[PDB]
Amino acid sequence: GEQGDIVVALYPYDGIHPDDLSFKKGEKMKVLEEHGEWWKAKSLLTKKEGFIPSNYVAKLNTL
Ligand SMILES: [Cl-]
Ligand SMILES: [Cl-]
């Protein structure tokens, strides 16, 4: 549902591997592709790409 859309981190996360994106609570990311539990994303702040745990983020356009 979120490919191409903007999510915000609910919780911070420090990457443990090079393919992970590290982020802070409140950081905005574009979802590049969903792959189940982990999504590939781009930080709108740093422009870096990597995988993120989807249960750390929520859609920015919430009701
Ligand atoms: Cl990073
Ligand atoms: Cl940000």
Side-chain angles (χ1 to χ4, degrees):
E2 284 292 306
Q3 196 291 312
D5 307 322
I6 303 172
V7 297
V8 57
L10 294 177
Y11 313 105
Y13 190 66
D14 292 334
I16 293 87
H17 296 290
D19 63 2
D20 295 330
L21 175 68
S22 291
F23 52 84
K24 295 295 185 295
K25 177 166 41 159
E27 185 164 354
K28 305 318 182 292
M29 294 170 278
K30 179 182 166 193
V31 179
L32 298 174
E33 193 163 30
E34 299 195 8
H35 295 288
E37 178 42 45
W38 292 70
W39 298 354
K40 191 177 178 177
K42 183 178 180 190
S43 167
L44 298 185
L45 175 60
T46 74
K47 312 308 187 187
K48 281 59 187 315
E49 301 193 359
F51 285 81
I52 64 169
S54 65
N55 51 1
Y56 284 62
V57 308
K59 73 198 280 173
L60 187 61
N61 55 322
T62 42
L63 287 175

